[PDB]
Amino acid sequence: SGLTHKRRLSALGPGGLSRERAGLEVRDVHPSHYGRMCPIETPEGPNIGLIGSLSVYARVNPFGFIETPYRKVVDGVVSDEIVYLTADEEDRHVVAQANSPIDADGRFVEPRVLVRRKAGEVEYVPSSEVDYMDVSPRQMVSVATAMIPFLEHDDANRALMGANMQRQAVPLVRSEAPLVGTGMELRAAIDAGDVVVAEESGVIEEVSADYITVMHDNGTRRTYRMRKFARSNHGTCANQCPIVDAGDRVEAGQVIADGPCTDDGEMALGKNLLVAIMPWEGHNYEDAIILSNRLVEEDVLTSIHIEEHEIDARDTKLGAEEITRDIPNISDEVLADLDERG
Amino acid sequence: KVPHGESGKVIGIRVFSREDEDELPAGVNELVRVYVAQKRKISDGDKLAGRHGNKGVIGKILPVEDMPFLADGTPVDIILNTHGVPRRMNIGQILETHLGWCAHSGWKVDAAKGVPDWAARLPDELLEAQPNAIVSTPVFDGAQEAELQGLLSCTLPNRDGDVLVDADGKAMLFDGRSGEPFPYPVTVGYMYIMKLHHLVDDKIHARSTGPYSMITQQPLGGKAQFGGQRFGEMECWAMQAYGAAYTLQELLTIKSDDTVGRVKVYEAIVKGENIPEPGIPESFKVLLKELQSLCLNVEVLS
């Protein structure tokens, strides 16, 4: 959720259009968004189209315009020179597709390949006019939409919901990494920042539920403190537990302690459940679901929720607010849990 | 005081004080913060979801004995309906289910005499996997249908040499409630499902009577105070369309802001008498006073 929040592009603010005064031509997906703003991940409510997310490879240039890397092909030879083009330059040239048949020598198998022409037009140009190619597929998607396996078998309507509902998942008491992922989980977990990563390589000296002490190759030592059962902005648990032992050697940039929804450094938002795809007696009728009682006995889908309560003592013109056990009109049975000073 | 509908252990207490020269907002002497924690299990009405937009609340939680179970006695954990898949065009969940079964059981492509054609462009060290193997299918370059079919055709037995899921990806289930086997094979596999932050325990609320507002004497709103559910304009149109005049009159007078009607009806209920007749709502009199404050001579005639 936080990583998705930090990579967000909202068209509404002081100096931008308004949710109640936005038409349908600004909520559309212009063909210039390819590689720069994800067409899937957007809110489903009355904010649909007014809030988007930055794609994986995009960067913002000094003037505030978004760019995407392209792999330039010189005389039919797909090079490895990456050049970042903004939408106008991408407009001038002709761009091929990433999943094209390269022949192990930077040469297309056939002459005819799908491309993108000036106004986003898709055509079949002989493979001699092609100027650029995408650095990869998964260049038009954002981080959250790149974690859906078999995304091209799902229609865009349901993929939007699948991407938007992954940032509403709650951390569970014990985390489990998916059996079938996409390879984006590790990068998204290490870049979000909820894990502890070894700053310098060395050997682990002490481990505990509260800290890890690393002994660096040159004299120095570093102790990493852990966040145990800490509340997040939305009232969930924020545990951190080590995944190294007292003798292991760690390297720079290595994950040294898990986080809320990580399983050994990879994002782990849910659990792997054995499923059947049958209708059963009308209890899974109209989008309803049937669960085994094992998932309750064995605490598979259990979560911890933490609450925060605040009070303060203030002077006031009359003066002297006090925190104390001596409260008027209160009995002792309702003053049993309180300690000696409130 | 801990507000309505909350409980749990006290895990932490953070107390600030001016005596210790802590930086507090001006005019504040002390500040104390208390943390209360709960552990919530999954229950009916909680919202679950997959990675392909297949959401849904939990309808029932069955005992482990009355669930469809495989030929070796393994019950299924979750049951999804068939009618939702083909109409929504999210067939990716079925392919995820198939590949999840293949990954759970582990496979071995038999290259006894030449690799099979479907496994020609399959990367090496994918020709065999151990049980509970973790794999990855990038978003637009992953597992083809032919490769999934081939992997399903070759998948390891569990403990005894029994293959529970056939080449189509379906299994013969037993009805754990009646005992007889289901007449046709069913699709089984492993799906990765998520628990969404839309739990029932934050959604359920009820009220007989409670706090009321100040300017207008209507009940408050929200669970943390107590508050009542709102009976809006559309719900009034619905009741006018039904023709139910007495239900509508009581809902708007002796349940909202008829200050004497409330106490009288409560007394009548507890004493077993007949519910009395409503009076005049207080919001109407507030309206009259505001209209008079705008220098308008509003008067009720007889």
Binding site: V56, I82, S136, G183 | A129, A133, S136
Partner: peptide
């Protein structure tokens, strides 16, 4: 893949990507 202690998650990818994913908080 390029992290010193990442788990071994075998991929079905047929293509090879020249460019690594940038820093996602850049």
């Amino acid at each position: 893949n390029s992290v010193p202690g990442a788990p071994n998650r075998v991929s079905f990818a047929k293509l090879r990507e020249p460019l690594e994913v940038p820093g996602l908080l850049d």
